[PDB]
Structure 1
Amino acid sequence: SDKIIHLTDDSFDTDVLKADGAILVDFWAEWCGPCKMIAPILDEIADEYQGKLTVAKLNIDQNPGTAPKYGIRGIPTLLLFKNGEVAATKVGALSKGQLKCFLDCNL
């Protein structure tokens, strides 16, 4: 969890929208079982992809406003930004194999 950027509604424009290169933003909440299931998987990808992209999470309990500006309907939802614009999204829980499948396709 040391390799994962903590986002807030206020920090978002700077950390994501203005970042150069690729960011994988994880929308999640403590009440979200399937969001917690993929947290470890996300830590390994921060690891293995450390030279390719940044991983970020935004808690929707404590930050209610950013997700609607993206039409996100419930969590987990992963958004891949490239230079502050969404390139692709993946809704629902997934496995390690499915997550790197998703990444290896847009990097």
Structure 2
Amino acid sequence: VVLADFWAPWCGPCKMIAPVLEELDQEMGDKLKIVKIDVDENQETAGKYGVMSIPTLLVLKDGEVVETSVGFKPKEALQELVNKHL
């Protein structure tokens, strides 16, 4: 189970989600991998997954996208989103 964060350095909401993902890694990092990808440097992956806004959070399970969340989310909402797929 992987939480992929599509972000950019200029994106205000993406700066707000960064500390939330660090807390989530401390609490769940034994069962959840967190991956960050910068859409300004990695346009091909952002295009492949059809991302058209940031932050976009993809929950992947064994390489397949099982859930998609757009915009800022608090920690508890990200935990609920990931715990469905653990």
Structure exhibiting the larger radius of gyration computed from Cα positions: 1
Name the CA distance, whole Å, in 2 between partners of 1:70 and 1:96: 23
Return the TM-score normalized by structure 2: 0.93
For this pair of structures, how many residues does the alignment match?
A: 86
Per the TM alignment, residue 94 of structure 1 is displaced from its structure 2 partner at its CA by 1.0
Any stretches of 5+ residues in structure 2 without a counterpart? none
Question: Per residue, is there more helix in 1 or in 2?
Answer: 2
Percent sequence identity over aligned pairs: 50
Match in the other structure for 2:72: 93
Q: State whether structure 2 residue 76 is matched by structure 1 residue 106.
A: no
Tell me how far apart the structure 2 counterparts of residues 83 and 104 of structure 1 sit (CA, whole Å). Answer: 15
> Which portions of structure 1, spanning 4 or more consecutive aligned residues, are displaced by more than 6 angstroms?
none
Uncovered stretches (5+) of structure 1, i.e. residues with no partner: 1-21
| TM-score, L = length of structure 1 | 0.76
The secondary structure found in structure 2 opposite 1:58 is: strand
Q: What is the CA-CA distance between 1:82 and the residue it aligns to?
A: 0.8
